[PDB]
């Protein structure tokens, strides 16, 4: 028995229906065979010990789910999922990771298999902290978020939560993976949007630490306060405020 929750009820059906919905919405993805996507997804973790998963296991899925996102329209986020997706819900030329096909398919789901059999484990799955970090879910997110960050160019944006004790956290997906996978060739600038929940937060010690990381990687850093998130979303919806 693992410590984490088991695979989400109706995981196979949910992934397939998400794929059908996404490929209907996006005409550039209507080529995608959703059965093949599911087979590739399932093939990454079925009949495998769920502490023994690697990025290689997900390669067939990455090939089938590959997508050209306009590299100058990428929004990264850390600990502020809610507002990030509300933003891209309105500003529809922009993409977070969960607005890509692969990110859309997996968002809010858990899954794992087992060594002995070809069955999905609905009982329990490894928790990253208590059991093992090389589990089907964590390895999936590590793989797709690295590729997404590698794809970015020009000005990459990151939404951060100004109400947290650490606005930027080095130990997050953003702070340990995405930030080291932005390519200095492609990416001229990382612009942080600090969301307030009020005074300028762009000199916060953790923002200074983010700046330091970014500069050391030969990318320019810029920081902006969003002092009133409501007004911000209203003004993106109707610019004429």
């Amino acid at each position: 028995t693992w410590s984490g929750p088991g695979t989400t009820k109706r995981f196979p059906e949910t992934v397939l229906a998400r794929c059908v919905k996404y490929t209907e919405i996006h005409p550039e993805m209507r080529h995608v065979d959703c059965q093949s996507v599911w087979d590739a997804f399932k093939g990454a973790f079925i009949s495998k010990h769920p502490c023994d998963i690697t990025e290689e296991d997900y390669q067939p899925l990455m090939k089938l789910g590959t997508q050209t996102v306009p590299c100058n329209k990428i929004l990264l986020w850390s600990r502020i999922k809610d507002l990030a997706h509300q933003f891209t819900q309105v500003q529809r030329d922009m993409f977070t990771l969960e607005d890509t096909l692969l990110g859309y398919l997996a968002d809010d789901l858990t899954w794992c298999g087992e060594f002995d059999t070809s069955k999905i484990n609905y009982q329990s799955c490894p928790d990253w902290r208590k059991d093992c970090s090389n589990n089907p879910v964590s390895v999936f997110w590590k793989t797709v978020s690295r590729r997404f960050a590698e794809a970015a160019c020009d000005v990459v944006h990151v939404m951060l939560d100004g109400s947290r004790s650490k606005i930027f956290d080095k130990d997050s997906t953003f702070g340990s993976v995405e930030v080291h996978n932005l390519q200095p060739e492609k990416v001229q600038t990382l612009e942080a949007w600090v969301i307030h929940g009020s005074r300028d937060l762009c000199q916060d010690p953790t923002i200074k630490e983010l700046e330091s990381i970014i500069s050391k990687r030969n990318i320019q850093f810029s920081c902006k306060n969003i002092y009133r998130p409501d007004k911000f979303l209203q003004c993106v919806k109707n610019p004429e405020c």
Epitope: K21, Y22, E24, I25, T88, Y104
Partner: nanobody, 128 residues
């Protein structure tokens, strides 16, 4: 809420083409499913064509399939109706309409839209 403005109507001979345009302002164009309707004189308004925000889904009136094509350009806040092989029975005022649509819409819901933003119309007359 979005303000709509049609143009490109005109007087044309049967068998010829016209391209209608409709520009939106106010709220972001890419938040709206767009529809073209038409009303001939003394007749009721009827649906002609529609398109999702993403251009992933279109719908057409049966009698215009393979003659009319709907499309859009969200960066220009514009929707188009390319009308080929026009017939005298295509004579009407053509109206552009908008309906808020989620980014992640169900294609099923494209059949039941009541459109709540309307342009003033563009006159199309087809002669013979």
């Amino acid at each position: 809420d979005v303000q709509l403005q049609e143009s490109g109507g005109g007087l044309v001979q049967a068998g010829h083409s016209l391209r209608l345009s409709c520009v939106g302002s106010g709220s972001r164009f890419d938040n709206y499913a767009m529809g073209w309707f038409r009303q001939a004189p003394g007749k009721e308004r009827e649906f002609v064509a529609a398109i999702s925000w993403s251009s992933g889904t279109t719908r057409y009136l049966d009698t215009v399939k393979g003659r009319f094509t709907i499309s859009r350009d969200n960066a220009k806040s514009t929707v188009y109706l390319q009308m080929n092989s026009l017939k005298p029975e295509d004579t009407a005022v053509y109206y552009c309409a908008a309906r808020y649509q989620p980014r992640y819409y169900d294609s099923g819901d494209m059949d039941g839209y009541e459109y709540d933003n309307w342009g003033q119309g563009t006159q199309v007359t087809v002669s013979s």
